[PDB]
Ligand binder design. Structure first.
Ligand SMILES: [Fe+2]
Length: 267
């Protein structure tokens, strides 16, 4: 495939498990999704929440274990990827050239939205990684425009990946164990239909249109990486669903999308 992706980083517990389909999908990334080695990777992280777009600019990525109450082994994982400082500067220029602000963090490593799926996709940790934050108090259209500014990166060998959670309710939302709560089916299906239809404006305006977005994304920070990845695919991309699974609690969903460009930018 070519283009950009919206993936789910999933449950860190899957590191210890054998039968999680999302992990199998991620492990097969280089065989089934992206054959060609990318020059660098831009991860739009649901777990880096800022006021204005921010990008990290480091030579070596720390591994940030920003998650609570997991088993000890999870905190010993190191994903020793190189940073991507030139990619970071290029993201800052592209955003500013489009009239958007962008700040640069020269210390922050990768949070688990980045390193956790990447350690399955690219276990050799030899691809330069740069993370981009989301701005959860801004709307879907903001995030789409951040991505649109970034689409020239596609012709430069950059793999752009939004890392979120397609259905990501509050911890207080009751479970439907080993099933799928109908509200979550409804939201997931609406989103799939909007994307496969090419109704990308609807996706940007999900708050006005999507059923049960209040349950699926009370904060939205796990959805907004989709808008950035979608915008980064340029005008009129074609979307396809490349993985779907659900957590055993029946209310977290991992629908995964590829956005294939049909247009390009100037020489
Ligand atoms: Fe998450």
């Amino acid at each position: 495939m070519k283009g950009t992706y919206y993936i789910n980083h999933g449950d860190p517990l899957m590191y210890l498990k054998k039968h999680i389909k999302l992990r199998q999908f991620l492990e097969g990334w280089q065989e089934n999704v992206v054959i060609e080695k990318p020059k660098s990777i831009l991860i739009i992280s649901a777990h880096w929440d800022t006021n204005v777009p921010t990008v990290n600019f480091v030579e070596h990525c720390d591994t940030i274990h920003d998650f609570d109450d997991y088993p000890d082994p999870l905190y010993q994982i190191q994903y020793r990827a190189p940073g991507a400082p030139n990619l970071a500067k290029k993201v800052e220029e592209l955003l500013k050239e489009s009239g958007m602000e962008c700040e640069i963090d020269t210390k922050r490593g990768l949070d688990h939205a980045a390193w956790f799926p990447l350690m399955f996709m690219y276990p050799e940790a030899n691809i330069p990684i740069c993370e981009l934050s989301v701005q959860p108090s801004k709307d879907g259209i903001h995030h789409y425009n951040v991505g649109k500014a970034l689409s020239p990166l596609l012709q430069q060998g950059v793999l752009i990946i939004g890392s979120g959670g397609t259905v990501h309710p509050s911890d207080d939302t009751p479970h439907c164990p080993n099933g799928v709560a109908p509200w979550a089916i409804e939201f997931d299906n609406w989103l799939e239909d909007a994307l496969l239809s090419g109704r990308y404006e609807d996706v940007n305006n999900f708050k006005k249109l999507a059923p049960n977005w209040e349950i699926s994304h009370p904060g939205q920070e796990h959805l907004y990486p989709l808008h950035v990845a979608l915008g980064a695919a340029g005008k009129n991309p074609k979307t396809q669903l490349i993985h779907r699974s659900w957590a055993a609690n029946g209310v977290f969903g991992y629908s995964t999308y590829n956005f294939t460009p049909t247009t390009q930018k100037t020489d």
